[PDB]
Structure formats: structure tokens, C-alpha cells
Amino acid sequence: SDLGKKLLEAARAGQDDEVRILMANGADVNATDWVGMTPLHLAAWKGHLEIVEVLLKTGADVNAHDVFGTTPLHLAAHRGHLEIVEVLLKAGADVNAQDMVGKTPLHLAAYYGHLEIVEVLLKHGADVNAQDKFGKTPFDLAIDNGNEDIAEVLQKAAKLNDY
């Protein structure tokens, strides 16, 4: 319990050596903080690639959901961490996971303007027609935020899917 708390703190802070020390001493790799986030959540969100990699290699739950229903892939998509998105997907991240209001990682990547992540997600089977609880698709969010390059890529994928 104490090691897990320290592991969470180390993962958030990007302290690679502390993370490994704690893991080598039995720290629960899937420990959760007060909002249900795991070391993998925090390292993925903050862009700490090496910590993500060691966590995944050692068996961390790639699709753990926090209290908001967001997964590590959601979080990497939010902050635009492309290489982390790729390793998460290779480790089995659910490309179409939905948080508590129905948002998928594609929603987040489209809204927050991360074009490359959008393309990678689509390539891994992201649902271009996914609607959140308010009926918004990723395309709607790109349009709402004036992310026109992303909107075009999403339109292309939808036109392919519609054939």
C-alpha cells in the first residue's frame, strides 16, 4: 500500500530510477490513487515514455479505467503523446474505450488537435462514428475547435467507411 502510493508519485513525476526501485521491491503496478488512476495512467498522461514501457513490460493493466472512466490511452491522446499512444496500442489498449460521458480516445485527439494521434487511432480501428453522451462525434469536436486538418482526415475516414 505504501509502495503503491510511492510508485504512483514516482510515475507522475517521471522518476525512472525510483519507479524501478519500487517495482523491484514489490510495488503493486496497478495501484490506484484517489481518482482511480494507476502509475500507467499518470506516466501516460505526463508523457513519461520509459515508465510506460517498463510498466507495460511488467504486466500493468493497459486498459485500467479511472473514476472518470478514462484509460491511459485516453490520457496520452489528451496531451498528444504519440509514441506512448503507439506503445499502449501495441500492448493491447482498447482503441474505442469510452469514459463516463462516452468519449473515446479519438474524441480527445480530435478535440485537442493531435493530428498524428488521430491518424494512428484510425489506423488501429478507432470508431469514426462514435458518439458521446451529447451525440458528438470526433468530427464534430474537430469542427467545434476549428481543427480543420483533423476534420478533413476524419471526413476521409468516414467516406471510406461509408462505402
Author numbering: 14 to 176
Paper lines:
Here, we report the selection of designed ankyrin repeat proteins (DARPins) recognizing mTFP1 (monomeric teal fluorescent protein 1). Here, we report the selection of DARPins recognizing mTFP1, one of the brightest and most photostable FPs in the blue-green spectrum. We characterized these binders both biochemically and biophysically and determined the three-dimensional structure of one DARPin-mTFP1 complex. The two DARPins we report here bind specifically and with high affinity to mTFP1.
